[PDB]
Design an enzyme around this catalytic site. Structure first.
Site, PDB file in Angstrom:
ATOM      1  N   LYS B  14       0.813  -1.215   0.000  1.00 43.08           N
ATOM      2  CA  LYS B  14       0.000   0.000   0.000  1.00 43.08           C
ATOM      3  C   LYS B  14       0.851   1.272   0.000  1.00 43.08           C
ATOM      4  O   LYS B  14       0.340   2.361  -0.267  1.00 43.08           O
ATOM      5  CB  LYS B  14      -0.961   0.010   1.199  1.00 43.08           C
ATOM      6  CG  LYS B  14      -1.947  -1.158   1.240  1.00 43.08           C
ATOM      7  CD  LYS B  14      -2.836  -1.220  -0.004  1.00 43.08           C
ATOM      8  CE  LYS B  14      -4.004  -2.183   0.200  1.00 43.08           C
ATOM      9  NZ  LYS B  14      -4.434  -2.866  -1.056  1.00 43.08           N
ATOM     10  N   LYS B  74       1.778   5.395  -4.791  1.00 39.87           N
ATOM     11  CA  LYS B  74       2.287   4.061  -5.102  1.00 39.87           C
ATOM     12  C   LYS B  74       3.084   4.044  -6.408  1.00 39.87           C
ATOM     13  O   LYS B  74       4.115   3.374  -6.504  1.00 39.87           O
ATOM     14  CB  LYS B  74       1.133   3.059  -5.194  1.00 39.87           C
ATOM     15  CG  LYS B  74       0.405   2.819  -3.882  1.00 39.87           C
ATOM     16  CD  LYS B  74      -0.830   1.960  -4.088  1.00 39.87           C
ATOM     17  CE  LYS B  74      -1.700   1.963  -2.850  1.00 39.87           C
ATOM     18  NZ  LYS B  74      -3.124   2.201  -3.196  1.00 39.87           N
ATOM     19  N   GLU B 165      -5.877  -1.448 -10.598  1.00 35.03           N
ATOM     20  CA  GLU B 165      -6.935  -1.351 -11.595  1.00 35.03           C
ATOM     21  C   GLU B 165      -7.533   0.039 -11.396  1.00 35.03           C
ATOM     22  O   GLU B 165      -8.245   0.563 -12.257  1.00 35.03           O
ATOM     23  CB  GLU B 165      -7.999  -2.428 -11.363  1.00 35.03           C
ATOM     24  CG  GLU B 165      -8.361  -3.244 -12.604  1.00 35.03           C
ATOM     25  CD  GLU B 165      -9.105  -4.531 -12.265  1.00 35.03           C
ATOM     26  OE1 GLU B 165     -10.069  -4.474 -11.475  1.00 35.03           O
ATOM     27  OE2 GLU B 165      -8.725  -5.603 -12.788  1.00 35.03           O
TER      28      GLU B 165
END
Ligand SMILES: Cc1cc2nc3c(=O)[nH]c(=O)nc-3n(C[C@H](O)[C@H](O)[C@H](O)COP(=O)(O)O)c2cc1C
Ligand SMILES: Cc1cc2nc3c(=O)[nH]c(=O)nc-3n(C[C@H](O)[C@H](O)[C@H](O)COP(=O)(O)O)c2cc1C
Ligand SMILES: NC(=O)c1cc(N(CCCl)CCCl)c([N+](=O)[O-])cc1[N+](=O)[O-]
Ligand SMILES: NC(=O)c1cc(N(CCCl)CCCl)c([N+](=O)[O-])cc1[N+](=O)[O-]
Lengths: 217, 217
Positions: B14, B74, B165
């Site tokens: 994360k 990220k 995604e």
């Protein structure tokens, strides 16, 4: 390092040695591989049929008819045969099942956290079934990701295998009554040990050069 | 190095540590994995964009500027960020490149075998574009399989990564000229090392029981 060798050396076996079976532990490991694969929002929109008996593989091999007869041997000679299946529709009951399972596993410190995870998956699940209208395809993608994980995984266990798309899904679905249970068969993967007849075991691997498929920025 | 150990210990990062970069050997290994993943008929209907430079990663993270802001850190903090792209349509030029590359790689003993290989691939490729009208989805599935293979591979290399995604594919496509070149972004996967501010690293893994997702015959 190590998996690079596995990746560069693994191959799609063209013929299996029916007498070479997976060890009792390996049989369990392949099941663990199947279940621990990642998936968008941890939706796990799949179901697997693992055939290890002569009768079981025969029922699976019913799908290797028509122009797919070339895959019958593989399905019958392998030690174990995995039928990867995707849900036909993403239902709220299953979504709830996924969150409750994460809650029971101790992933949520507060009830607010659990609720925030339900929301996150909900938005994604909705985006596909209500706006883009591609929920079946979205779920099938996750099953294919699972297959990728599975292929390298069994190869790393010293096992041989072959992903198969050449089979009759209608015949397979009907044989195992997947339609009513809410599933569709997508890929069949026999796993075991290749035989001397596996001409692909000695052939060089072939891939397109990186200058064509890869761009570095 | 047990593959089952990596499957059970891997996780979706994360948050990454910007200072920890991949070694030159790992950066090369990552590209080897993307290239050698299997695919239906060795179609390799994909394209990869690997961003290692801060300016490159910045461009990718532009796709998460909308309501996907949380995913921006990220794509920037990670050492290398890989975006998997699928071909929009299977052209005869691509089918030619694949069979020619296989021929160059010595997979064919005679000119008749090369022809038969090209015939089998075309058979499968035609059925998807002409009859099932799902070539775009069939190729997207191969790309997802590549992602599954990839995630396991990097995990086994001792690297942290996360499939994403949650990004606007339309923005990303336009940012890298995709669509014009014949590709569309599907998944973004930042690779590197996790930071101490990663809660998912201490959190337990959660998957549905096998009694629900798996059937043995
Ligand atoms: C195709 C795909 C898309 C994902 N997209 C995201 C994303 O946008 N953001 C995120 O934080 N995690 C994302 N994930 C991570 C999933 O939540 C994660 O795989 C799942 O919860 C299982 O956890 P694990 O990966 O640690 O086993 C994605 C996973 C997959 C397979
Ligand atoms: C989704 C998928 C479906 C495949 N279907 C078949 C099949 O029906 N029969 C077969 O013998 N090989 C099949 N293959 C094997 C591919 O041709 C193989 O992955 C490709 O030629 C690359 O070779 P490798 O797996 O040895 O690296 C399939 C592969 C994938 C990924
Ligand atoms: N794309 C999704 O909406 C998604 C959302 C979330 N969060 C939950 C609140 Cl919406 C937002 C921060 Cl990423 C996470 N998550 O937990 O990391 C993962 C995914 N996921 O796809 O798997
Ligand atoms: N030439 C190849 O190695 C090859 C061979 C086969 N077969 C022979 C093994 Cl029994 C079918 C002919 Cl009966 C299949 N396959 O099963 O379809 C696929 C490929 N393939 O790479 O495309």
């Amino acid at each position: 390092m190590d998996i690079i060798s596995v990746a560069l050396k693994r191959h799609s076996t063209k013929a299996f040695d029916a007498s070479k079976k997976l060890t009792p532990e390996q049989a369990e490991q392949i099941k663990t591989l199947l279940q621990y694969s990642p998936s968008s929002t941890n939706s796990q929109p799949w179901h697997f049929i693992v055939a290890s008996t002569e009768e079981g593989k025969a029922r699976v091999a019913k799908s290797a008819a028509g122009n797919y007869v070339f895959n019958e041997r593989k399905m019958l000679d392998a030690s174990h045969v995995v039928v990867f299946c995707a849900k036909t529709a993403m239902d709220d009951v299953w979504l709830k099942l996924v969150v409750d399972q994460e809650d029971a596993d101790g992933r949520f410190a507060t009830p607010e956290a659990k609720a925030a995870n339900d929301k996150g998956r909900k938005f994604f699940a909705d985006m596909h079934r209500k706006d883009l209208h591609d929920d079946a395809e979205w779920m099938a993608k996750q099953v294919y990701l699972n297959v990728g994980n599975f292929l390298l995984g069994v190869a790393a266990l010293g096992l041989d295998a072959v992903p198969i798309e050449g089979f009759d899904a209608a015949i397979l679905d009907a044989e195992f009554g997947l339609k009513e249970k809410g599933y569709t068969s997508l890929v069949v993967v026999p796993v075991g040990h290749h035989s001397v007849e596996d001409f692909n075991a000695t052939l060089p691997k072939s891939r397109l050069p990186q200058n064509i498929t890869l761009t570095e920025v």
